[PDB]
Amino acid sequence: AISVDVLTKYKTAAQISEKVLAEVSKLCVPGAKIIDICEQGDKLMEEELSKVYRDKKTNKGFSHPTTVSPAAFITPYTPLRSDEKEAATEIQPGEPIKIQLGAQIDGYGTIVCDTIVAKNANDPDVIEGRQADLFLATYYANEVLLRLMVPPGLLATGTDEEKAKAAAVKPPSQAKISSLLEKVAKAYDCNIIESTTSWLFDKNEIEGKKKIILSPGENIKGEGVPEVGDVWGVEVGCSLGSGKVKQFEQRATLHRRTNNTYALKRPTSRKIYSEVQKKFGTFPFSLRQLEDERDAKSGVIECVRGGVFRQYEVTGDKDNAPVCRLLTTIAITKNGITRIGGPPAWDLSKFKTDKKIEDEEILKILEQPLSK
């Protein structure tokens, strides 16, 4: 069981992340410059952070930089101010924008990601066409995934014999999880984004010792099963295209410190390394967050080459089609699955399409509860 102390720190992080997410989503209007939004989000996060756990030397910070990703972007986007062309990128109207960010208290982080439609306050709320399909695929993929993560039998009802039959059912393989989510996307003629990964979280860790990898494809596979006591960053992504991923040309700015001990030779490497250890610890950060972009670009090179920073390469839809993503931080307890921190529920009434999930296996899963 997760202690009150730990659960409460995750929860403090979630409330901060959800509040910053809401403030950042309001800034995502057509014409807004992405770099301004990320900077403002990061600023908000720090303000919110300074308003809690003030007493004592309680560590705290970002679990994830504010990122704002256009239509076909998969890697969370957070560009440099000194990259003139990138830093002038503006929100395009009607595009699906991924906003992913998060906070961190005493090494317990919550990461959240919502996808919204870029628009002005007095634009219509309705989403239609294949864009409605893209969103609904992602929504239902998420609802299905979350239910596939409830440990077998935890919430089974009925006779003792039914309850025992449920608890003795093996946790679904990751291949089975994948094919079901693919089925969900297909009902909307969308595809799951290859290798979309959910990670176990732990103290100072957002890429823990268990992970679920959706539609792995080839020489890749996830390992580990969700258990009562776990906290997970649960992610789903869909594409109006094939759901294939490809490297784009924007500068990689998203990184995180690893636990590798490689000795850095270059002084700007060590300098940036120490700056990051102190501010972010082992949590993801954007190069734009560092004190000096020129130092950032110089030192990051050896840090990545040496394996002490992990670099998250810039990727986007291989077909250059729009993508949709959700990321929820959950807790698994006695009572099932609780969403500690995530995106605000979507009003399904706003989505307009003829498409519908018809597969019986999937509709049945959707009837299963997430918790008691």
Author numbering: 12 to 383
Give excerpts from the publication.
Expression, purification, crystallization and x-ray structure determination of this protein was successful, supporting the value of C. thermophilum as a model system for structural studies. The two selected adaptive proline mutations (P41, P104) indeed occur in loops of ctArx1 preventing unfolding. Another fundamental concept in thermo-adaptation of proteins is an increased bulkiness of hydrophobic amino acids within the protein core. Direct sequence comparison of ctArx1 with cgArx1 indeed shows that 80% (16/20) of the hydrophobic amino acid exchanges lead to increased bulkiness. Several of these adaptive bulky hydrophobic residues in ctArx1 (F146, F362 and W357) together with V128 form an extended hydrophobic cluster, which together with adaptive C335 leads to a tight packing of helices α3 and α9 to the central beta-sheet. Acquired electrostatic interactions are found between the imino-group of W357 and D124 (β4) linking β4 to α3 more tightly and between adaptive R350 in β13 and E154 stabilizing β13 with respect to helix α3. Mutation of F146, W357 and R350 reduces the thermostability of ctArx1 by about 2°C to 51°C. In addition, mutation of the two hydrophobic residues (F146, W357) on top of the five adaptive mutations leads to a further decrease of ctArx1 thermostability to 47°C. Taken together, these examples of adaptive mutations in the context of the 3D structure of ctArx1 illustrate how individual residues and their interactions contribute to a thermophilic adaptation. By solving the 3D structure of a single thermophilic protein (Arx1 of Cth), we could identify three different types of adaptive mutations : (i) loop rigidity by increased proline frequency, (ii) increased protein core hydrophobicity, and (iii) increased electrostatic interactions stabilizing neighboring secondary structure elements.
